């Protein structure tokens, strides 16, 4: 079944790229909320 | 006396042998394409 996982592996590699970039995008949004008087980050 | 006999006729066309012949050719062409690419059906799964 490993070679049948290769047929769909191309769909997962672009998915892990979006998850990589959306988490970098979430991290930069979170860096900006820090300077906004939110005591949750404490 | 065939008016009280002979049994009932059938409008039967044998399209199922033609449908099976086309299905068997599709498995042949899908197999030849697999061999020329070096990517088996065992190699596809």
Curated annotation (Swiss-Prot), chain B:
Places the protein is found: Virion
UniProt subunit comment: Homododecamer. Interacts with the Cargo protein 1. Interacts with the major capsid protein.
Function recorded in the entry: Forms the portal vertex of the capsid. Probably involved in head assembly, genome packaging, tail attachment, and genome ejection.
Name of the protein in question: Portal protein
Organism: Bacteroides phage crAss001
